[PDB]
Amino acid sequence: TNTIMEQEARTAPQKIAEQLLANDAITESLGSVLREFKPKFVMIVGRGSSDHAGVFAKYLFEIEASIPTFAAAPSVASVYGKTLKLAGGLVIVISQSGRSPDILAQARMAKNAGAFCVALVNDETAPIKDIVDVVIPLRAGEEKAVAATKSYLATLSALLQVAAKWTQNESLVEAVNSLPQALQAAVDAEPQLRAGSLTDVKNLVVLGRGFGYAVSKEIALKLKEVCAIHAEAFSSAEFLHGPVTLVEKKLSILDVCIRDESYGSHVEQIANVKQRGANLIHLHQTSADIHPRIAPLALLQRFYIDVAAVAIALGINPD
Amino acid sequence: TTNTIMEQEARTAPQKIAEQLLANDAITESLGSVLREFKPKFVMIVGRGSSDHAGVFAKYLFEIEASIPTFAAAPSVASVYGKTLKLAGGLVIVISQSGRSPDILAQARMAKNAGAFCVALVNDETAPIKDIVDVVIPLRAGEEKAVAATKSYLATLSALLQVAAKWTQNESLVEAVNSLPQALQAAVDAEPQLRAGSLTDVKNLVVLGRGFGYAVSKEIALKLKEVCAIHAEAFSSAEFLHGPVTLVEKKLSILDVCIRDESYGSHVEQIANVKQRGANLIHLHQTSADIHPRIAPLALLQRFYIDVAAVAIALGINPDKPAGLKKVTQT
Numbered sequence: 001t002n003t004i005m006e007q008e009a010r011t012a013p014q015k016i017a018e019q020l021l022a023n024d025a026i027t028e029s030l031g032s033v034l035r036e037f038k039p040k041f042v043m044i045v046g047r048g049s050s051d052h053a054g055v056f057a058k059y060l061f062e063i064e065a066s067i068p069t070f071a072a073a074p075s076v077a078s079v080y081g082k083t084l085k086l087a088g089g090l091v092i093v094i095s096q097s098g099r100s101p102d103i104l105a106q107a108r109m110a111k112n113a114g115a116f117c118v119a120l121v122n123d124e125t126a127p128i129k130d131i132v133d134v135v136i137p138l139r140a141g142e143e144k145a146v147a148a149t150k151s152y153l154a155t156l157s158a159l160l161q162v163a164a165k166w167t168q169n170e171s172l173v174e175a176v177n178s179l180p181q182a183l184q185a186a187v188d189a190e191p192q193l194r195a196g197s198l199t200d201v202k203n204l205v206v207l208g209r210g211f212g213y214a215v216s217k218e219i220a221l222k223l224k225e226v227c228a229i230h231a232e233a234f235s236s237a238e239f240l241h242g243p244v245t246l247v248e249k250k251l252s253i254l255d256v257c258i259r260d261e262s263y264g265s266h267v268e269q270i271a272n273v274k275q276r277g278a279n280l281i282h283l284h285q286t287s288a289d290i291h292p293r294i295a296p297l298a299l300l301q302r303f304y305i306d307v308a309a310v311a312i313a314l315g316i317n318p319d
Numbered sequence: 320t321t322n323t324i325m326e327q328e329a330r331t332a333p334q335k336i337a338e339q340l341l342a343n344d345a346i347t348e349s350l351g352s353v354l355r356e357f358k359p360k361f362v363m364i365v366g367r368g369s370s371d372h373a374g375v376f377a378k379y380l381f382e383i384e385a386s387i388p389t390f391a392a393a394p395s396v397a398s399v400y401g402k403t404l405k406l407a408g409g410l411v412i413v414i415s416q417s418g419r420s421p422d423i424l425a426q427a428r429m430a431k432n433a434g435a436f437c438v439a440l441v442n443d444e445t446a447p448i449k450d451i452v453d454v455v456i457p458l459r460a461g462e463e464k465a466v467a468a469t470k471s472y473l474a475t476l477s478a479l480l481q482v483a484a485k486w487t488q489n490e491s492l493v494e495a496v497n498s499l500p501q502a503l504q505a506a507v508d509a510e511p512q513l514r515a516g517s518l519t520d521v522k523n524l525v526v527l528g529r530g531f532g533y534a535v536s537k538e539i540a541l542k543l544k545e546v547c548a549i550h551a552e553a554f555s556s557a558e559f560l561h562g563p564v565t566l567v568e569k570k571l572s573i574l575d576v577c578i579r580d581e582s583y584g585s586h587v588e589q590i591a592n593v594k595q596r597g598a599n600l601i602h603l604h605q606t607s608a609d610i611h612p613r614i615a616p617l618a619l620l621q622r623f624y625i626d627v628a629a630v631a632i633a634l635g636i637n638p639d640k641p642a643g644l645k646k647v648t649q650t
């Protein structure tokens with residue numbers, strides 16, 4: 001494919017390699033601040049792909065750092081005019097552009113309530129840098145495609161590095177170091193999502209569990225954004241509590257399979273909706289040696305290239 | 320009338336809630352003093368399905384009315400990854416009609432083991448959640464026999480509101496709770512809003528709301544999946560523009576959840592935008608009755624529950640027992 005989306009997606013391994021080297025000192029310093037600060041919770045501020053990145057941070061910081069983590073509801077402030085008690089907590093503002101006024105207004109509120117504030121932004125110069133305490137630059141470069149690809153993976157890579165520095169888990173440190181090579185391997189692997197599966201498919205469900213669910217939300221957003229498919233992401237545990245009735249009528253399901261602690265639970269539910277008659281399409285990791293916490297990113301890196309081709313086959317310009 | 324268990328159970332909700340608010344006055348008054356002494360750093364909500372969606376209502380409620388960060392637990396953190404969180408000094412509310420899902424129970428045990436003050440809002444008095452937590456607030460909705468929750472969700476919201484009124488002691492919230500049965504009854508008596516003809520030939524749609532209206536939108540979208548087999552997805556009307564709005568390029572049905580609260584201005588402006596872009600709009604509203612803005616979401620929903628029961632019949636689904644569902648689901 002010759003779209004901006006695919007071209008930008010293919011630069012993600014090398015954009016991240018430069019990011020991990022360039023940010024090593026920044027995130028090394030931040031991890032010690034967090035080890036001293038000992039945040040009571042982490043609140044994520046962002047929209048769209050950045051908000052989905054925050055769902056990844058929830059699983060990351062709760063599993064790896066034991067810190068309760070969640071997403072802000074911007075309307076609480078911008079519509080209802082309320083402040084939250086955020087003293088003793090960490091606020092992470094995620095924004096590729098980093099200049100939208102809604103985003104800046106919530107950063108000011110978070111700082112005014114006593115939170116330690118960090119921003120993950122692609123433009124380090126934007127005025128958000130004057131509000132927050134620490135800026136971690138995404139270093140993804142300009143994103144010209146409508147669909148975020150590299151800027152999302154660079155958000156995850158920054159979150160993983162902050163997590164590796166903060167917790168100091170050496171296993172997680174090696175996974176972050178292996179990220180560029182793992183992503184490059186994903187780019188070179190064979191396609192998984194093929195357009196023939198998605199012909200005449202107006203809506204579908206993306207099923208995942210754990211980190212795989214967090215990446216499902218981003219896959220679901222991309223299916224909407226570049227394929228005009230009404231795709232909705234569910235945890236495979238949550239799907240059984242009502243939504244599974246849609247499998248009684250024809251339903252396509254995109255299965256996000258991650259080889260981590262969640263695998264056992266997740267495959268049990270994939271078998272169930274399969275017996276119930278759903279048309280499964282299986283996404284999985286791209287190489288055998290990939291660390292479980294990094295496997296979600298490689299799956300997405302592969303999906304980004306494959307979904308660009310699916311968009312073209314459906315007559316949509318993903319850009 | 321649909322003669323379904325779902326509709327019948329939904330119609331008992333004003334009386335069930337009136338009885339609940341009066342029976343729980345003592346326990347909820349005590350909990351409010353506990354919360355004023357405990358001073359929670361945050362509220363974490365544990366639940367699935369309609370109970371998880373009720374927790375989204377609690378987020379807007381406790382954040383707007385008490386300034387306490389509020390959010391949903393990811394049970395897999397505990398039940399699959401086996402981690403305990405640092406929860407000392409935080410409040411954990413387990414919401415469950417049945418009180419038996421194992422991911423829910425494992426997450427309650429880990430919250431209790433982590434030093435959090437734990438509260439359960441549960442309908443089934445016999446459920447094992449009562450043996451893990453510190454305080455139980457009985458929902459007092461009676462047995463719910465339809466698979467689709469109606470009264471038990473409204474009773475969850477009514478308990479969350481009473482807890483808020485007792486904890487904050489805001490006279491607005493106290494008046495809102497005092498007025499709730501009458502608002503629910505008025506909604507039961509109001510004219511139907513959602514009609515089956517609006518949803519025939521709709522395989523998927525978007526529910527749009529903002530604030531508390533977004534919170535009830537998630538429950539509406541689940542009901543449309545659960546009893547109408549429609550792929551309904553709920554979005555905030557702020558969030559919808561960041562990508563999902565692309566679905567308006569083809570024909571797209573949109574269910575508009577309109578709440579006459581602080582969110583009204585932003586929301587109606589965005590409804591007008593997706594209308595101009597070519598979306599097929601369907602409007603739900605709080606009923607004409609003079610409703611407190613914080614009770615308006617519940618009243619809209621009380622109306623929707625009865626009306627959706629008729630949509631289910633018209634689409635050939637038995638809302639009481641949809642083809643692939645149990646009342647007590649275990650994950």
Ligand SMILES: CC(=O)N[C@@H]1[C@@H](O)[C@H](O)[C@@H](COP(=O)(O)O)O[C@@H]1O
Pocket residue numbers: 051054055071072073074075076529530533554555556557558
């Ligand atoms: C749960 C989560 O990951 N994020 C949600 C997001 O999906 C939603 O769109 C937003 C609405 O914001 P609003 O209340 O400002 O409209 O609230 C939350 O942060």
Ligand SMILES: CC(=O)N[C@@H]1[C@@H](O)[C@H](O)[C@@H](COP(=O)(O)O)O[C@@H]1O
Pocket residue numbers: 209210213234235236237238371375391392393394395396422
């Ligand atoms: C309001 C909100 O964002 N709630 C989500 C819920 O939608 C999701 O289904 C669940 C998955 O739990 P799991 O990690 O056990 O699958 O986690 C979160 O609490």
Ligand SMILES: N[C@@H](CO)[C@@H](O)[C@H](O)[C@H](O)COP(=O)(O)O
Pocket residue numbers: 046047048049050094095096097098100103146147148149225560561562
């Ligand atoms: N372009 C979409 C993602 O592909 C959109 O959802 C995007 O993530 C969001 O609207 C912008 O967020 P930002 O502040 O990170 O740019």
Ligand SMILES: N[C@@H](CO)[C@@H](O)[C@H](O)[C@H](O)COP(=O)(O)O
Pocket residue numbers: 241242366367368369370414415416417418419420423466467468469545645646647648
């Ligand atoms: N029956 C459904 C709601 O109509 C289902 O999603 C339900 O809410 C879910 O299984 C959780 O049930 P609980 O409240 O008994 O925990």
